[PDB]
Amino acid sequence: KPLPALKLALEYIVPAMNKHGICVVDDFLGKETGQQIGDEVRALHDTGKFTDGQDIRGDKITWIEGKEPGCETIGLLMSSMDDLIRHCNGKLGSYKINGRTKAMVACYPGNGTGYVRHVDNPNGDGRCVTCIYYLNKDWDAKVSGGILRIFPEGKAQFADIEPKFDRLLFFWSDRRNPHEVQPAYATRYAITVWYFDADERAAAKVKYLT
Amino acid sequence: XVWLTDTWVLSRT
Ligand SMILES: O=C(O)CNC(=O)C(=O)O
Ligand SMILES: [Mn+2]
């Protein structure tokens, strides 16, 4: 009953991303797996593993590789994301996607926290696609806010993305999609991975010193 | 199983 990943990628994600630069897949993993991911994320939060995401942003974050004890289902989510990008078979724009970040697990801990309008990759750092999975059971922005508002370039209207349970979102990471997280009034969780274009990443426009 | 192509949302199920 769920669309197979290969068909989902080729028949929907590829055409939607090339047409709109934004693509939402609802009901990505199903209730049982979405809930397990929630349990794993709440466990990370409750045992104090998050740090300040940073005013520009009021989220708390941690990075997950996917093999850590207690993170097996998050690892399943990450491999499911990777499978979708592989099935896209180079058809997302002209990018040569060969890598990605670890998963960024993020919490906006209610109390009106959010993220001011920003571009993920404004300086050519190689990130081409942002992939976010939301895991907020019964989230309703009418009560709890927390909408992701995207302002796609060339378009007059904005795109509001509620951080709905089991919702997968893709969007170009570059200046085409400035976006903001509106104030959140309940605990809002999301997991993001960014995918890299091989060539842009190799141009080393950003040097990280330590 | 229906994508309204002027939109950017689809349910997988
Ligand atoms: O959580 C969201 O919906 C969006 N998050 C971000 O814009 C980010 O962390 O860069
Ligand atoms: Mn962002």
CSV table of C-alpha atoms and ligand atoms in Angstrom, one decimal:
chain,number,residue,atom,x,y,z
A,1,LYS,CA,0.0,0.0,0.0
A,2,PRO,CA,2.9,2.4,0.4
A,3,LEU,CA,4.3,3.4,-3.0
A,4,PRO,CA,7.6,1.6,-3.6
A,5,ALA,CA,10.6,3.8,-3.1
A,6,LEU,CA,11.9,3.5,-6.7
A,7,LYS,CA,8.5,4.6,-8.1
A,8,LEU,CA,8.1,7.4,-5.4
A,9,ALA,CA,11.5,8.8,-6.4
A,10,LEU,CA,11.2,8.7,-10.2
A,11,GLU,CA,7.5,9.4,-10.6
A,12,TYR,CA,7.1,12.0,-7.9
A,13,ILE,CA,10.2,13.3,-6.1
A,14,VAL,CA,12.2,14.0,-9.2
A,15,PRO,CA,9.4,15.8,-11.1
A,16,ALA,CA,8.2,17.7,-8.1
A,17,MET,CA,11.7,18.9,-7.2
A,18,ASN,CA,12.6,19.9,-10.7
A,19,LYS,CA,9.2,21.8,-11.0
A,20,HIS,CA,8.9,23.4,-7.6
A,21,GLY,CA,12.2,23.0,-5.8
A,22,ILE,CA,10.2,21.7,-2.8
A,23,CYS,CA,8.7,18.2,-2.3
A,24,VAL,CA,6.7,16.8,0.6
A,25,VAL,CA,6.1,13.0,1.0
A,26,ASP,CA,3.5,12.3,3.7
A,27,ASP,CA,3.2,9.0,5.5
A,28,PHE,CA,6.8,8.2,4.6
A,29,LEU,CA,7.6,5.3,7.0
A,30,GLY,CA,4.2,4.6,8.7
A,31,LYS,CA,2.9,4.9,12.2
A,32,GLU,CA,4.9,2.1,13.9
A,33,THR,CA,8.3,3.3,12.5
A,34,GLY,CA,7.5,7.0,13.0
A,35,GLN,CA,6.6,6.3,16.6
A,36,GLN,CA,9.8,4.3,17.2
A,37,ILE,CA,11.8,7.2,15.8
A,38,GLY,CA,9.9,9.5,18.1
A,39,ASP,CA,10.8,7.2,21.1
A,40,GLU,CA,14.5,7.3,20.1
A,41,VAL,CA,14.5,11.0,19.7
A,42,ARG,CA,12.7,11.6,23.0
A,43,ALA,CA,15.2,9.2,24.6
A,44,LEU,CA,18.1,11.3,23.3
A,45,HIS,CA,16.4,14.5,24.6
A,46,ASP,CA,15.4,13.1,28.0
A,47,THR,CA,18.9,11.8,28.7
A,48,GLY,CA,20.4,15.2,28.0
A,49,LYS,CA,22.2,14.5,24.7
A,50,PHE,CA,21.1,17.8,23.0
A,51,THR,CA,23.2,21.0,22.8
A,52,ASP,CA,22.4,24.6,21.8
A,53,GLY,CA,21.7,24.9,18.0
A,54,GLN,CA,22.8,28.5,18.1
A,55,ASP,CA,19.1,35.5,18.4
A,56,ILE,CA,19.0,33.4,15.1
A,57,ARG,CA,17.8,30.0,16.2
A,58,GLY,CA,16.3,28.6,19.4
A,59,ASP,CA,16.6,24.9,18.7
A,60,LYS,CA,18.7,22.3,20.6
A,61,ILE,CA,20.5,19.7,18.4
A,62,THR,CA,22.6,16.6,18.3
A,63,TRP,CA,24.3,14.8,15.5
A,64,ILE,CA,23.6,11.1,14.9
A,65,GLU,CA,25.6,8.8,12.6
A,66,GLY,CA,23.0,6.1,12.7
A,67,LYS,CA,24.9,3.2,14.3
A,68,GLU,CA,24.8,4.4,17.9
A,69,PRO,CA,23.1,2.2,20.5
A,70,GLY,CA,19.5,3.3,20.8
A,71,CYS,CA,19.4,5.0,17.4
A,72,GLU,CA,18.7,2.0,15.2
A,73,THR,CA,15.5,3.3,13.8
A,74,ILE,CA,17.0,6.7,13.1
A,75,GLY,CA,19.6,4.8,11.1
A,76,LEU,CA,16.8,3.1,9.2
A,77,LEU,CA,15.4,6.5,8.4
A,78,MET,CA,18.8,7.7,7.2
A,79,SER,CA,19.2,4.6,5.0
A,80,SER,CA,15.7,5.1,3.6
A,81,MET,CA,16.5,8.8,2.7
A,82,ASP,CA,19.8,7.6,1.0
A,83,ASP,CA,17.8,5.0,-0.9
A,84,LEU,CA,15.5,7.7,-2.3
A,85,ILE,CA,18.4,9.9,-3.4
A,86,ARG,CA,20.1,6.8,-5.0
A,87,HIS,CA,16.9,6.0,-6.9
A,88,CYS,CA,16.8,9.6,-8.1
A,89,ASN,CA,19.7,8.4,-10.3
A,90,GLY,CA,21.2,11.8,-11.0
A,91,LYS,CA,18.0,13.4,-12.1
A,92,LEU,CA,17.8,16.0,-9.4
A,93,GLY,CA,18.9,19.1,-11.3
A,94,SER,CA,22.4,18.6,-12.7
A,95,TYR,CA,23.9,17.6,-9.3
A,96,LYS,CA,26.3,14.7,-8.8
A,97,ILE,CA,25.2,13.7,-5.3
A,98,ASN,CA,28.0,11.6,-3.6
A,99,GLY,CA,27.8,12.3,0.1
A,100,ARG,CA,25.8,13.7,2.9
A,101,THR,CA,26.0,15.0,6.4
A,102,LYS,CA,25.2,13.0,9.6
A,103,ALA,CA,21.7,13.5,10.8
A,104,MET,CA,20.9,16.6,12.7
A,105,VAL,CA,18.3,15.8,15.3
A,106,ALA,CA,16.7,19.1,16.4
A,107,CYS,CA,14.2,20.1,19.0
A,108,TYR,CA,12.5,23.5,19.3
A,109,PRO,CA,11.5,23.3,23.0
A,110,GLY,CA,8.2,25.3,22.6
A,111,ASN,CA,8.1,28.7,24.3
A,112,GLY,CA,8.0,30.5,20.9
A,113,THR,CA,11.4,29.3,19.7
A,114,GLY,CA,12.1,29.2,16.1
A,115,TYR,CA,14.6,30.1,13.4
A,116,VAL,CA,14.8,33.4,11.6
A,117,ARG,CA,14.7,33.5,7.8
A,118,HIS,CA,17.9,32.0,6.4
A,119,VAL,CA,19.4,30.1,3.4
A,120,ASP,CA,21.0,26.8,4.4
A,121,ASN,CA,23.9,27.0,1.9
A,122,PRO,CA,24.4,30.6,0.9
A,123,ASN,CA,28.2,30.4,0.4
A,124,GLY,CA,28.8,27.4,-1.9
A,125,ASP,CA,29.6,24.8,0.7
A,126,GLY,CA,28.5,21.9,-1.5
A,127,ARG,CA,25.0,21.2,0.1
A,128,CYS,CA,22.5,20.9,-2.7
A,129,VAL,CA,19.4,19.2,-1.1
A,130,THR,CA,18.0,19.5,2.3
A,131,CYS,CA,16.0,16.5,3.6
A,132,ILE,CA,13.9,16.8,6.7
A,133,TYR,CA,11.8,14.2,8.5
A,134,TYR,CA,9.2,15.3,11.0
A,135,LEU,CA,8.1,13.1,13.8
A,136,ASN,CA,5.5,15.2,15.8
A,137,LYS,CA,2.5,13.0,16.6
A,138,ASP,CA,-0.7,15.0,16.3
A,139,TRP,CA,1.0,18.3,15.6
A,140,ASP,CA,-1.4,21.0,14.7
A,141,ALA,CA,0.0,24.4,13.8
A,142,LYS,CA,-3.3,26.0,14.8
A,143,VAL,CA,-2.4,25.2,18.4
A,144,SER,CA,1.4,24.8,18.4
A,145,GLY,CA,2.7,26.9,15.5
A,146,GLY,CA,6.1,25.8,14.3
A,147,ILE,CA,5.4,26.1,10.5
A,148,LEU,CA,8.3,26.0,8.2
A,149,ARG,CA,7.7,28.9,5.8
A,150,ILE,CA,9.7,28.7,2.5
A,151,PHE,CA,10.0,31.7,0.2
A,152,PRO,CA,11.0,30.2,-3.2
A,153,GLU,CA,12.8,32.6,-5.5
A,154,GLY,CA,10.9,33.7,-8.5
A,155,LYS,CA,7.5,33.0,-6.8
A,156,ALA,CA,5.3,35.6,-5.2
A,157,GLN,CA,3.6,33.2,-2.8
A,158,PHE,CA,5.3,31.4,0.1
A,159,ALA,CA,5.0,27.7,0.9
A,160,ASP,CA,3.9,26.7,4.5
A,161,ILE,CA,5.1,23.2,5.6
A,162,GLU,CA,3.5,22.0,8.9
A,163,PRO,CA,6.0,19.7,10.8
A,164,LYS,CA,3.5,16.9,10.6
A,165,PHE,CA,4.1,13.4,11.9
A,166,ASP,CA,5.8,11.0,9.4
A,167,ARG,CA,6.3,13.9,6.9
A,168,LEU,CA,9.4,13.8,4.7
A,169,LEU,CA,10.5,17.1,3.0
A,170,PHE,CA,13.1,17.9,0.3
A,171,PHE,CA,14.1,21.3,-1.0
A,172,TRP,CA,17.1,22.9,-2.7
A,173,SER,CA,19.5,24.1,-0.1
A,174,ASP,CA,20.9,27.1,-2.1
A,175,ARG,CA,19.6,30.7,-2.3
A,176,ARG,CA,16.5,29.5,-4.2
A,177,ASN,CA,14.8,28.6,-0.9
A,178,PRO,CA,15.2,31.0,2.0
A,179,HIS,CA,13.0,29.8,4.8
A,180,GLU,CA,12.1,30.3,8.5
A,181,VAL,CA,10.8,28.2,11.4
A,182,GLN,CA,7.9,30.2,12.9
A,183,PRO,CA,7.5,30.2,16.7
A,184,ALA,CA,6.9,26.8,18.1
A,185,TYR,CA,4.7,26.5,21.2
A,186,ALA,CA,5.2,22.7,21.9
A,187,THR,CA,8.2,20.4,21.6
A,188,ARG,CA,9.0,20.3,17.9
A,189,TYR,CA,11.3,17.5,16.6
A,190,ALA,CA,12.8,17.1,13.2
A,191,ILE,CA,15.8,15.1,11.7
A,192,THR,CA,17.7,16.7,8.8
A,193,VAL,CA,20.3,15.4,6.5
A,194,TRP,CA,21.9,17.5,3.8
A,195,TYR,CA,23.2,15.9,0.5
A,196,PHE,CA,26.4,17.2,-1.2
A,197,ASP,CA,27.2,17.8,-4.8
A,198,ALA,CA,30.6,16.3,-5.4
A,199,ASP,CA,32.1,19.1,-7.4
A,200,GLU,CA,30.8,22.0,-5.3
A,201,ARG,CA,31.9,20.3,-2.1
A,202,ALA,CA,35.4,19.6,-3.6
A,203,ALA,CA,35.8,23.3,-4.4
A,204,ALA,CA,36.5,24.0,-0.7
A,205,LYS,CA,34.9,27.4,-0.7
A,206,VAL,CA,34.6,27.0,3.1
A,207,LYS,CA,37.6,26.0,5.2
A,208,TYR,CA,36.8,24.8,8.7
A,209,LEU,CA,39.4,25.7,11.3
A,210,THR,CA,39.5,24.2,14.8
B,1,UNK,CA,-2.0,7.8,-5.5
B,2,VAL,CA,-2.8,11.2,-7.1
B,3,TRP,CA,-0.3,14.0,-7.5
B,4,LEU,CA,-1.9,17.4,-8.2
B,5,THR,CA,1.1,18.7,-10.1
B,6,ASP,CA,0.6,22.3,-9.2
B,7,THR,CA,1.2,21.2,-5.6
B,8,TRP,CA,4.2,19.8,-3.8
B,9,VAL,CA,2.6,17.3,-1.5
B,10,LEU,CA,1.8,13.6,-1.9
B,11,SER,CA,0.8,10.9,0.5
B,12,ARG,CA,2.9,7.8,0.1
B,13,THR,CA,-0.1,5.7,1.2
C,1,LIG,O1,13.1,22.3,11.3
C,1,LIG,C1,12.7,22.9,10.2
C,1,LIG,O2,11.5,22.8,9.7
C,1,LIG,C2,13.7,23.7,9.4
C,1,LIG,N1,15.0,23.7,10.0
C,1,LIG,C3,15.9,24.5,9.5
C,1,LIG,O3,15.7,25.5,8.7
C,1,LIG,C4,17.4,24.4,9.8
C,1,LIG,O4,17.7,23.7,10.9
C,1,LIG,O5,18.2,24.9,9.1
C,2,MN,MN,17.3,25.7,7.3
